[PDB]
Design a protein around this ligand. Sequence first.
Ligand SMILES: [Zr+4]
Length: 173
Amino acid sequence: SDLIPAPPLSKVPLQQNFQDNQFQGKWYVVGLAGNAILREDKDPQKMYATIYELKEDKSYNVTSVLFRKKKCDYWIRTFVPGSQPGEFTLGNIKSYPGLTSYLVRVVSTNYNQHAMVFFKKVSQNREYFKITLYGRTKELTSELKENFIRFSKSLGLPENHIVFPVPIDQCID
Ligand SMILES: [Zr+4]
């Protein structure tokens, strides 16, 4: 298919003095945007959650749970600290078939309510990016939703590649 290009990393801020210990725990995905994300009127996008647990060596074990087809689907990732704090790369990338590049950058967070994280990957030689708006709860202020929209557009995404998943209780409590 056709894809809105990944922006240069220069357009993607890094959270200053990132605190990896304070970033741990459960985060709800309250907003989602990217070049392979489309707004779906039929079966709209359900909220999922992602738990960041800091390992002794300072990598994250990252677990996500989605409710799908009457069950909880879990997937696990290891994020390995990169060049500066708040940048990560994917651990054990050999084990993901098709996957050649995977980069995470924490754009901003106040640690105890919200965060914005940028993801870039190359899979079957196609370049995907997305941005999650994370909340420690399932709702955030309009102000932060609008800032997430402003930022997503600044990276070239139109309105219909920006989604706000509907809150649910299954799995993610
Ligand atoms: Zr992924």
